[PDB]
Amino acid sequence: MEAKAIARYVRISPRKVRLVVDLIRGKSLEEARNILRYTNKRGAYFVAKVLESAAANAVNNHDMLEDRLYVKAAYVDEGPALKRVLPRARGRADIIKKRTSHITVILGEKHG
Amino acid sequence: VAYSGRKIWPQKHTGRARHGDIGAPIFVGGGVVFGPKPRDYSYTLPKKVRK
C-alpha cells in the first residue's frame, strides 16, 4: 500500500529542487519533515508541500497510519519551460529558460 | 510562390549560411522543385491498334 502526491508545473528549476528531494528520499515521514524544515533552499518549501499532501492522502484515503509512513520513492521530472528574452549588449538578445518542475513523493508504510 | 525577392541577410559575415529569398526550395515553405504541373496525359494510339 502506497500513496503519492504530485505538484505539477511548479515553477522552480528541476536541477535545483532535485537536490532537496534527494535529501529525504527513503526517510521516515518524520525525519523528512524535520529535514525540510531546516533545509536552506527555496525548494525545501515545495517538497514540503508535496510530502505533506502525500501523507494526507496516505492516512485519509488509503488506510495507512501516519506513524508508519516513509518516503518510498520521490523524484523531480521537468515540465514545459518558460522562455523569456534576456537583452544583451550590442543589440543581441539571448533567451532565458525559466524552467519548471513536476515534483513527486510516494509514501509507503514501514512494516513493524 | 508568395514571397519577396529580398536577400534575407547579407552574403558574407553573418556566421549563418548564404541565402537569397525565402522562396528558395531549400527553405521550408519555399517553393517546390520539379513538382507536378497541370498536364495532358493522353496520346494518339494508332487507329489500327484500337480496331
Binding site: 550590442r90 543589440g91 | 541577410w9 556566421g15
Partner: peptide, 22 residues
C-alpha cells in the same frame, strides 16, 4: 636573426562587427 625584412602577412585587427543579424 633574419635580415631580409619580414613583412607582415596579415592586417592588424580589426574593423567593425556584423551586428546584428536579427
Amino acid at each position: 636573426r633574419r635580415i631580409r625584412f619580414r613583412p607582415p602577412y596579415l592586417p592588424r585587427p580589426g574593423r567593425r562587427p556584423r551586428f546584428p543579424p536579427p
